[PDB]
């Protein structure tokens, strides 16, 4: 029943909030999926502020 | 995936809710005691 | 006529048809495929031979040195079979290699040998075939099951109209080879030709042909034909060829020499296209506005700028047409496409085409083919060449290039085993016909498109992955290459290679335990024909089209057998006469008719050439001449059949049988049943379990004799001669003098296998079947196997049936057994079990074999002997020890209660616990043999040191009438030499054999072998002095055991199951049922001499499920039976064998034109008595299937005994003793037993073991484990209001781990109460989820 | 490990067979009975996953016991021997139940 | 403890795919904080953070995201949404239908001797399955002094078991089951009567209720517990009950 | 027709005579009682019993043009049984998968 | 030629 976690070095995407079908991360930044993958895969930055 | 987002919440009130968390189906000798619950809160 | 060996019991045959072909060797798939395998192939075909010529020679990379092949060896087996089966090993061969490796000179690209090394190598083993062909892999004897995939090649294919709405039948031909990337064609609805390859992303279909560097050009020039136009003093005259107007509206007036042939708007006609063709009109004027819908071929460029007027595959423009004229151009040539008969669909897959240039296509596929990398050049052009036309990464193997090239209408059957670009481009021609209309598609169920794998091609090409396995790291390894720090085992690994062979043989989907627990079932399960395993459809894929039995496999592939199921279909049976064609494909004999007459010339007919000539009926009549008898004959032509002249059949069939299977040939009058019930029959038939008295079909069909002698069970002799010694366990043949070789000891010892656990854990035996001082010849039996009586396959028993309905215990299909069938001990089997007692290695210490079990009382232990293992021969029940194993325990604990009792009652606790083999629950049985192994290096116990010392002495008895029998020839030899002149007929075989050897003979090899004898003689002695030293060191050598187990003991048990109510039984024909009551003999109908019913089938299963069969074969065994019982009450009274002889000779005699001819004249008054003594129990009736006893001769035959003409007597009722109105039928039907005995099935569980991550119980009846109670069960309940029931269904009996020990608690306090809880699995799918990112809660109020 | 791998393959390739955990003990130098340790160390865990035929498509581990629980006629039988041993320490005396009960 | 190690006898261990799941996210976690530590050049850093968002991808559902990352022995790894996902999830596996205690199966036969309140049910299965029931009542009448006593004396078979067995057996109805259960008929109760033999002898007039031949049909037994169970079983899921069909 | 004359000649072909010349009344043949009880077999069955059976299609559905004109008590030959075996498998590899 | 994959190994 005790669970453990694990400290992340650097942050990660939960797939299913990214990859299920519509895609919660894609529609919530009113982003396509594609270009959000270019920035996950460290293809292509990406603007904030 | 859906309802992690939209923080939904289940109250069982179904038989195969009942039958998943294993208690009585509301359906036939268990439909008393969900009535009888039903009361049991709410009174 | 017959085999002295024939005559103990010769079978009546009503077989109206002769028989041409002898039906072959029904093992000959698999022996002959592994036998092309491991074999010495002095050529570079097939074998061990292919794959090494193939890899090999392994050269470096330019590095002066190469590896070659040179030869191989085979060495032999370390263990012969039973050793290996004893010992749990692989049965196998060393396969020895004599590569030879060789430096070249230095700095000289033709560099001499400098310095060349050979030296023989193990690679790996190979498991050989057994004569049976089954392996005995880890001691369980498999089978590799043939496999049916699709023939590598080109095949066209429809895909019709399914694809798109439109309807429009997409096109597409598939490339395959046996070895590399697949290569796929096809047509979208816009006609725009499309190539995959390996199925990823489609293309314009002329990229690989840019790739085959054709400019724009020579591709139009390929794919079509010209049309040329002559700019003739006026704007573009034609040149037409005659044809080209076909089915086509002349918008034109369209005349010639002055003479308008054709009016504007007027489809040309036939007469117009002749007239022009008469005329001879080739260059015709026409107004140039027609040119504005062609296209151009070439590339038009001006002279004075040299410019590019217009562009390869340019639409006309009449601006173009003024810009070329201006330049002056003579020709003007363009493409010639129709909607018809030429269509345009390279020149519009060119227009939606981006690629231009070679690098653009090659960079192109590269893309498709590797997406993200960069593309470069020199890797895209490997990448491409590398794809279809190296040697290594792809081959269509002559199998392939012949059903190319024959696809292809090419005229060659031998070629390249890579693409080239002609075949390519062919294969892109003939879809384009294909498409355009002439040609046909193919359908992947043709038995023509459909090879087969055997097992050596399996192996091989599991062999040859294992070799380029090798030369990767040989070629590593050659690279930083010495000279002659390294031998050639230094570079070669075996564990590649072996692991390859050795991981396909053990573990495929193709290579499964024998299915052995009958004759039957082994020799149809070696004959299969898989459609799964690797490199084939699966049970998902297909897919209805595959599944059915198309009309090809007359005489290839049986259609009523397969095993039903989730696979129908695609385990498709080898027929009777099938034989595999040089390349794979699956052919059939069909007799060869002449003009005239039907020529006995058999003569193999593949799947394909089957479709063109004309084949007639195997039932056709015709009589003494050769000649048909009617004026036209069925036949069958292609896929059809129908009356055809008498001079216009070309083969006829072999044989009636030649359709079916071998499963489906035993079964007496098939053609009466239902294809459906013979369907369950002939896959039934071969789960019937060897009973205890091999019996005999009553009424059979003549295939058994062959399907028992082709098994492997039954033992028959090598060389005739004379039976010397018959044991119960061996056989002794006196060869004889003719048979015998020139010099060698002529006497054949034959091993019987006396009661030895088989797969299904039944018990396979050998009895002999010979009698001391008969003759025998070759080709016969010696010893009946299991479920086999004298020869003939005898599978189950025959009973006397009845077919009435009794009080409904036959209800549904239940069976109504009397007592005096379970009392005769008729189908009583007897079933041999192994248990094991692993005894291994813990860090508390070891387990011992002890025989001081702690808690248990003497009479417990009476059983074994000092050193822990039971006495062979000791019956034992159900929960019995049989090896007393303590495994060392340490420090458990003690609860409060407990250390107050312990200290109450003074008692020490344990050191060691207690975890000895014991008897499984309920059954019983005689230990029929226990085996120690140990370990090397642990010191042997008593019963070790017993077990050596017996099979000590046995392995010296029998190896020393080994040594008796060699001698014997070599003394033979030498009275050969000194009788041939010299010889003492008294004077030297009075005193004793030894005194033989010194004694001479004048000037000559007489004079001398002086040597010769003593030389052989002194070799047999020492020579066998080592080989009795060998076999007495694989006795006692320790044996190999895996790591950590001391020793192993294996308590082989021989349970003897009787027959009870449940045990399920089924005939023949598909009539199964499970015996529902064991009546007493009383209770029995009995007719009016008072002989009881065996068996009371229902009479109202036959109507609906219409398997007639079983009332014929009632009918006729009761015929039979009836001659049965005249020769007994003939051989009571034992008048005369005269009258015997003649009655016999009349049942034989009787039938309508049958074949079976026998003249008991010529049978001696010694043999027509054993004859007859073989014919008391009832004279055994034979019936070819397709051929059988037709009803008129049964009644005939009925009417030879007494019996009546129905087959319906009057049967009594053995209770109220009152006639049964109406009479019912008995007869004997032949009744099987199959193994689906009841007390495998019982099963019941309280409370057990748990399963450990979702605390549950466990799978079934081997884990003792309950049932499942699934979703369907639920919706059952729930359906009911039974929500109590269900509560408890799914949280105590099942999950709640704290409430299911409370609920034992309260069941047994006498207080049914319960309490519910949360069950675990529900709160391992909290853990689940909640182990994610997800936070699921309970809301708690 | 790969020490004796090593030597195990040059040892197959050259007695022609695969060499008996003895005979490693002489090409090597190991007491002979490290090397059965070495060798008796574990191989990769089979997945608990493995497809095992059969019967409705059920991996390996539908097939592994719980051996930490205890069976409930143990546990049945702890409550009784606890309520025997109350009704018998019951018989004694006060004091001597007390003593016994600390004890 | 959901995820385990366990050792299957034999010395072999038998984890679990998870295992091999977090240790692949764990170890290239700790490899990222280390080429974090040496300050690494960037285009390391970042193939180790997509190698980490992989692992950790390949943790939460295998198979979505490009290609799976395959098992030891040549497989897709099973990760946590294919715990849950599919026929074979804990959703659909081992929540909804559970395996279940008292039960067993055996080959049914026909019996027409019989009511159609009852079913022919074995000795021997009876035994098995009533073996709670059985302990209580053998030390309720005293014939066997503690609970062990009373499970060798039903192990040994005595006389008395027998008649305990007949006993608690009496008016105790038990739910005979056969495989595809279609409709809600397919499940009724019976009220056993104790035969030798080892087939569950069902009633004729049953068949076309549960659709049964009687050519190797096998059925499950499974029992009402507690005592309102058995008084579903008799007044709800009796076979005297349910004689018409509700479709 | 050859239908309606087998259940003709099955159904009734019992004549009798009750004090009398002879009457006909419904038979008494075993197959036939079986078959008109309810108890087993529709007259399907009993016309591929007695009268020719059907008219076999090959997987395709395409209705063959010439019946299997030979029914279970005399014997279909081998070609009339391959083609009887098309369409048991057929119904076969459905009821598998319905 | 940024997309178009999801392997690592390429990128
Ligand atoms: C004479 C003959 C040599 C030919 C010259 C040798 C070769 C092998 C010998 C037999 C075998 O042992 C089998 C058999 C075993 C019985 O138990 C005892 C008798 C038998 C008949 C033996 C007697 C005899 O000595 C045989 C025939
Ligand atoms: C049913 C199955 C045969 C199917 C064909 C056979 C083949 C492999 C057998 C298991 C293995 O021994 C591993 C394991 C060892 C434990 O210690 C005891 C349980 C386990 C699960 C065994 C039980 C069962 O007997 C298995 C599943
Ligand atoms: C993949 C294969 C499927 C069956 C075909 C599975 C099913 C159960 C597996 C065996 C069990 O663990 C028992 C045994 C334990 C030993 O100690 C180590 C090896 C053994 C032989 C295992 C190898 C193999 O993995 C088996 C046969
Ligand atoms: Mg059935």
Redesign the interface.
Known sequence: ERMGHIELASPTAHIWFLKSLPSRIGLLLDMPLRDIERVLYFESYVVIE | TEAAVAGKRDELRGLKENVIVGRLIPAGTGYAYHQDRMRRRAA | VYSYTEKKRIRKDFGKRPQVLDVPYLLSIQLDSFQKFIEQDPEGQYGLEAAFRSVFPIQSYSGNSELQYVSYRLGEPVFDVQECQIRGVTYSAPLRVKLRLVIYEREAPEGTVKDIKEQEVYMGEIPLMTDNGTFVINGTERVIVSQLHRSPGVFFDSDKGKTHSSGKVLYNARIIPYRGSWLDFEFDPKDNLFVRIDRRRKLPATIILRALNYTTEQILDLFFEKVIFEIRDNKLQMELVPERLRGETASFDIEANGKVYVEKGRRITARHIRQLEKDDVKLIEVPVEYIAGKVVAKDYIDESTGELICAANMELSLDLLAKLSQSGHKRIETLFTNDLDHGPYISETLRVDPTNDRLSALVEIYRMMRPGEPPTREAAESLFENLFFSEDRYDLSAVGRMKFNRSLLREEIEGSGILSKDDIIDVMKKLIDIRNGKGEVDDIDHLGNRRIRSVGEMAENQFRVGLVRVERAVKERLSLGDLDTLMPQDMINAKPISAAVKEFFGSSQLSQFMDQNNPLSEITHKRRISALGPGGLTRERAGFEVRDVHPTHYGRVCPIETPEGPNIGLINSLSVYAQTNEYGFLETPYRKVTDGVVTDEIHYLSAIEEGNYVIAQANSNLDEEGHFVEDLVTCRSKGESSLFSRDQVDYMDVSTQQVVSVGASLIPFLEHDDANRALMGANMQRQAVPTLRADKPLVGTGMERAVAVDSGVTAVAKRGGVVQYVDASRIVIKVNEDEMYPGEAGIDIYNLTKYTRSNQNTCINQMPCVSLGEPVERGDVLADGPSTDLGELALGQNMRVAFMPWNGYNFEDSILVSERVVQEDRFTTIHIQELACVSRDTKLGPEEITADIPNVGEAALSKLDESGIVYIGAEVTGGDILVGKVTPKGETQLTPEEKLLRAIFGEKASDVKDSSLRVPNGVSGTVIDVQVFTRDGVEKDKRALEIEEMQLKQAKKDLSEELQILEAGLFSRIRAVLVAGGVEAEKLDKLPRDRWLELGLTDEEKQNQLEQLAEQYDELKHEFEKKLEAKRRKITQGDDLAPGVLKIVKVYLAVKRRIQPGDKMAGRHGNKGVISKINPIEDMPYDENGTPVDIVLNPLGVPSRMNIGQILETHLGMAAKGIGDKINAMLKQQQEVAKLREFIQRAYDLGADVRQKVDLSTFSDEEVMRLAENLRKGMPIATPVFDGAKEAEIKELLKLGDLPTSGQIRLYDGRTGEQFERPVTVGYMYMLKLNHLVDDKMHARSTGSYSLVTQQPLGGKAQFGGQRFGEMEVWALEAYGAAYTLQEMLTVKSDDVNGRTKMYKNIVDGNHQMEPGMPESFNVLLKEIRSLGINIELEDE | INKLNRIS??M???M??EP???ELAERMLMPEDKI?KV??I?????????PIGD?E??H????????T?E???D????????A??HDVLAGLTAREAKV?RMR | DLRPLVPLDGGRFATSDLNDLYRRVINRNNRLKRLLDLAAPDIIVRNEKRMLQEAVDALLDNGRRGRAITGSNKRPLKSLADMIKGKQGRFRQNLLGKRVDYSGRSVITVGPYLRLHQCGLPKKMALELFKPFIYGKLELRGLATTIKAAKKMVEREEAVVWDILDEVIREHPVLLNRAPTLHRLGIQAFEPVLIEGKAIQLHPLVCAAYNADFDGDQMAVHVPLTLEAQLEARALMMSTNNILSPA | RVSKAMMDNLQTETVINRDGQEEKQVSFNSIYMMADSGARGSAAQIRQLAGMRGLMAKPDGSIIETPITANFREGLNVLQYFISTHGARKGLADTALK | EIGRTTDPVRM
């Open positions: 393959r040059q197959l390739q050259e022609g067979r008996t955990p003895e059965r060798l008796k574990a191989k990769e865990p089979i997945s608990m996953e493995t019967d498509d059920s390996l581990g539908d097939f592994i016991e719980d051996t629980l069976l409930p006629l546990s049945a039988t702890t409550e009784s021997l606890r025997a041993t016994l």
